[PDB]
Structure formats: structure tokens, C-alpha cells
Design a protein around this ligand. Sequence first.
Ligand SMILES: *[C@@H]1O[C@H](CO[C@@H]2O[C@@H](C)[C@@H](O)[C@@H](O)[C@@H]2O)[C@@H](O)[C@H](O)[C@H]1NC(C)=O
Ligand SMILES: *[C@@H]1O[C@H](CO[C@@H]2O[C@@H](C)[C@@H](O)[C@@H](O)[C@@H]2O)[C@@H](O)[C@H](O)[C@H]1NC(C)=O
Ligand SMILES: *[C@@H]1O[C@H](CO)[C@@H](O)[C@H](O)[C@H]1NC(C)=O
Ligand SMILES: [Cl-]
Ligand SMILES: [Mg+2]
Ligand SMILES: [Zn+2]
Length: 609
Amino acid sequence: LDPGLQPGQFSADEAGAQLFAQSYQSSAEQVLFQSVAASWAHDTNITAENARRQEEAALLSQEFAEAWGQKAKELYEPIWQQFTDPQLRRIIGAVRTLGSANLPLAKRQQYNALLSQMSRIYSTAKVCLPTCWSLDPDLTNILASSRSYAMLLFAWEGWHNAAGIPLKPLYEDFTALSNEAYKQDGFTDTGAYWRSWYNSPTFEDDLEHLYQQLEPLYLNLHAFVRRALHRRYGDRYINLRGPIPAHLLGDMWAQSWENIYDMVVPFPDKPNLDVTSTMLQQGWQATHMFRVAEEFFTSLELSPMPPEFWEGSMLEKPADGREVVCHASAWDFYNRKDFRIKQCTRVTMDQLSTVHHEMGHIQYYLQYKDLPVSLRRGANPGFHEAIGDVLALSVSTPEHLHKIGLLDRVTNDTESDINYLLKMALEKIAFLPFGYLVDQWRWGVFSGRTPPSRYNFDWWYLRTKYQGICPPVTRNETHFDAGAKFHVPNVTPYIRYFVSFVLQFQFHEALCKEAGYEGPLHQCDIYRSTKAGAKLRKVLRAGSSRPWQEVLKDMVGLDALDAQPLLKYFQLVTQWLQEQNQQNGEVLGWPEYQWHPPLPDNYPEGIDL
Ligand SMILES: *[C@@H]1O[C@H](CO[C@@H]2O[C@@H](C)[C@@H](O)[C@@H](O)[C@@H]2O)[C@@H](O)[C@H](O)[C@H]1NC(C)=O
Ligand SMILES: *[C@@H]1O[C@H](CO[C@@H]2O[C@@H](C)[C@@H](O)[C@@H](O)[C@@H]2O)[C@@H](O)[C@H](O)[C@H]1NC(C)=O
Ligand SMILES: *[C@@H]1O[C@H](CO)[C@@H](O)[C@H](O)[C@H]1NC(C)=O
Ligand SMILES: [Cl-]
Ligand SMILES: [Mg+2]
Ligand SMILES: [Zn+2]
């Protein structure tokens, strides 16, 4: 390790630890920069050479973590836990947690290479024909817009087989090394480490209690959408008492259903709330979508995006033949200057939402960039994922869309309310079972409850139990369908999105009240409210300097996750769906749990290109 980056000498007392922490932070800045820069060069240009460079930067990061953690142990291990300063307790407790730096050199190298290779496999996989299709944009476009049973099947099967099958042996090796690493920090397994970020003894029980409250809304949305699908695909491919085939819901993972709005919309002669065709008619591009998102942030007196953001970001998929990680992300270089998005932006209404999601992450980085590096994080990971989604709730209202020239016609009547709440339910309520189940699967893999011999059997148990879907072709343990979802090979934790989907409605309700808005919660738009801005700004500036339960209390009046704001927002549509399903004679749930659809005639030969 460079002489400049090694730990010096400090006294073995709380006062010494104060000096240790400040010195620790001043070094960490330079090591973080080199890591993030190498990661950017690879994720925007996947090559064997750029992987080698990123692995070399990762190794340096591990060498730094080891040197500083050992010093914390040497000086503090028997005393830091009784330190008078809560904040200090927080940094020393982190510094003595070595993670992958606990591995011996040869295994550290093995671990870093596995990360590179899993990322490559996912982001470069394609589906070839009898020139090959990428996930983004080509397969994503098919799953969103095709109403051909056989074309949808070709895309879902091609993707799952191409991405998932080769990942399995690498994912087994990654799991074992990750657990060996975190075990030496005193965690039972890696999942116990990930859950410890919420600092709550009752986390899994509290999540289980939230889901019991939300499940009836999901079951009612599921039954009404199954019926709408039946009226299009017919009795051969839809069983009104069984699971829905996993490729027909608008999305490769069936995780949100807004792309099948046209098939589900209750009252089709009210205003058309999907504005994608208007964006295309008006000639919107990626640069327009980013500028319009920026202007929502400045309307609240939050920060614009700096020159370095515009000069360095990647806002469209490269047209030069580079392979890239298309799944969107926001980057803090840890130098208080360089902040960037990398998104393969397409011109659609759901992508405008995604732009706001990413720009939320940037705004958090701008607001806490002056805190010590160890505290440049969200209050918990759910808070970081929620910020942009909250502003997108306001943007998507019919009233806001009118203000920005995306929806000419204005109506305020009960049918128009039901259309809007149903469209928002397809986006937010359909996701809840998926946002809950992903880390239940992964926690069972890290604990050993799910060995490699049961990866796919236990994935499909969960997908059917929670989402009420079935795979549309037969699967066995050579398939690794969890591996065909970004966050699994890219080692990104998922329970943050279930947390975020609950939190965002808590935050929206609080900001709408601070704005002085007095109408129905689902019609609030906080645009141009400088008072809502100031309240959100207090959250962002806090970083991880204070317990999330306290930050939440200051913001919304309660110190806990709470489903009541979500239920209040959806109340009218919750009642309407329950009455429609009863009048229609639906069965709620999927009692014919063994059912799978038949194959199309001639499959796969009878599809044009
Ligand atoms: C598992 O499946 C492999 C791929 O075969 C395809 O998927 C299976 C589920 C069947 O539908 C089969 O008709 C398909 O062509 C098979 O190659 C394999 O031999 C099956 N068994 C094992 C152990 O992989
Ligand atoms: C839409 O209408 C909501 C309901 O308004 C109340 O009831 C209707 C029947 C009328 O009598 C009206 O004058 C009442 O105030 C309002 O709460 C809501 O603000 C309106 N929202 C928008 C965006 O126009
Ligand atoms: C992609 O990275 C390679 C290194 O493997 C480099 O030669 C090439 O110039 C890069 N391309 C771009 C467009 O940055
Ligand atoms: Cl998380
Ligand atoms: Mg979508
Ligand atoms: Zn995010």
C-alpha cells in the first residue's frame, strides 16, 4: 500500500480513536475515487482489459481495508463498544468490519474475478434467431408491447436460458466465498450482514406484518388482471383458477404491470394516461427528459445538476459497438465534484419515471457531499431508493402532466380517478410480492437452507406463493432463473425496494401536508413548493449521521415503517376492485397451483422474424 495511505500512530483511548477516525477518513477519499473510476471505465465499456484494471483497483481497496481494520482491532477492540460518542461508535464499528478483506490473497483474487465474470455474463447475454437481441432495448420492448403469445414466449425463454444457465456455477462459488468473508466479522452468513444495516432486532417480523396488510390488495389486483388477460388470450393460455403465465404481464420478471394498462383500463373513453405516444409525437429525447426532471428539483429549491454531471454522464446506449451495463445507476466519485448517471434511456413514460429515480440518488449525493465519507450514505438503503420515486408520484398525476404539455384534456370525476389509481396500482401494488420475495430466496441461499440442488425449485416455490405466476415452459435444476434478474449476478440487495415502496407513500403524505395541499392524497402535486423542498432537504443533508428511525420521526411524525399512507392513497381503487371481483364471480388466489399453459402450435417455428 502506498506510504501515503497507511495508518500512523494514535493513543489507545476514546480521544485517540477520535484522531484515528479523522485520519481514516482523509485517506479513504483517495481509495474510493480510484475504485469508482475503474468501475466506471468497465461498466461503460466491458472488455477483458477493463475487468483486469477494475480487479487491480478492487485489490488495492481490500489492502486498505485490511490495514485500517487491523489498526482498529490493535488499538480499540476491547473498548470501542463503551465509547461515550454514539457517532464514533458507528465508524469504529464499520472499520473493524473487513468483509472481503478478511479473505487470503488468492481467494480475494478469486472473489474479485467472479464479480467481473458474473457482470459480463448478464450484461452481454443475447437471444439469437433462426443478428441477436439484447435485453435492453430489444427484449424489454417485446415484453412491453407484443401481444403475440409465441413471440413473448421466445423472448422470455431465450433470456432465462441465455443469462441464467451459465451463471449458476459462478454464483455457487461467490456464495461460499462471501460467507467465508463475513463469518470472520462474526456474522452467521452474508444475509445477516445485509439485514444488520436496518439496526432493528425485529426486522423480519416487521416486514412480515407489513406484507399481511398489503396482500389483500395484491390478490384483488391479480384476479381482475387475470380476467382481463383471459378475455384476450382465451381459455387455452389463461386458467381463471390458476397462476398467470410469467411472460404476459408487460415485463421480463412480471414485476410490474403498467405496460399492459391498455388491456386493463376500466373506462377507456376518459383521457389516455399513458403519455408515451405523445412524447414520441412531440420528439422528446433523453436530454429533454433529464432537463425536465432537473427543473422539478430546482422548483423545490433543491440543487441543479453541475457541469461535471452533463459532461461525464452516459444518457443513451452507445452506438459504436461497445458492450455496456445498461441497467441504470448513479455514481458518487467521493471527490465532492464528479457525479454521473449511466442509463440506456428510451423515450417512454416509465423511463421518465426511471430518470427521476436516478436523479433522486444524485440529489442525495449533492446534499451530503460535505459530511465525512463514512456518513455519505442513505439513512438506510430504502431511503436512497425512495427519493426520486416520491417526486415521480407528483409528476405522474393527470394535473402535472397537463402543466408540462403531455395531456391536453382535463377531467375530475370518479371514473377518471379509478383509471389513474388502477394505473398506479399496476406499477406499485403488483411489485410488492416481488420486492418481498427476492431476498427471502437469497437469504435462504446464504444461510444454507437452499443449497445449489434446490436453487430453481425454491425460486419457483416463492414466485408462485407470492406472485401467483407460473413459468410458461418446463424448468429443472440446470436452469437458474434467479440469475436472469440483474441484482443477483450484480450482488445488489433487494429488500430496500420493498422498504422503499412503503416509505415513498409515507414521504409523499408528509410533503403534501407541508406544502399546504388539502385535496385527495392521489391528486397532490408538490411542484414549486419551496416548503416541501426544505423538509426533504433536511433528510438528504443528514446522510447516515443519525439512526433512520429518528430521521423518519422528524420527517413524518412516526419512527417506523407504516402501510397506512399507501392504503389511504389507494383506498378508492381497493374498494372498487373488491366489488368488481365479487360481481364478476372471481376466485381470489390460484388453487390450481400445479397448472402450466400448453405450448403454441409449431413452437418455436411459426413466428415471423
Ligand atoms: C433439463 O432441461 C434441459 C433443457 O431441456 C429443456 O428443458 C427441460 C425442462 C425439458 O423441457 C426439455 O424438454 C427441454 O428441451 C434438458 O436438456 C435436460 O436434459 C433436463 N434435465 C437436466 C438434468 O438438465
Ligand atoms: C377534484 O374534486 C374533488 C372533489 O370535490 C368536492 O366534491 C365535488 C363533488 C364538488 O362538490 C367539489 O366542489 C367539492 O369540493 C376535490 O377534492 C379535488 O380538489 C378536485 N381536484 C382537482 C385536481 O381538481
Ligand atoms: C474501451 O476500452 C478499451 C480497453 O479495453 C480501449 O482500448 C477503448 O478505447 C475503449 N473505448 C472507448 C470508446 O472508450
Ligand atoms: Cl438493502
Ligand atoms: Mg415497465
Ligand atoms: Zn436506485
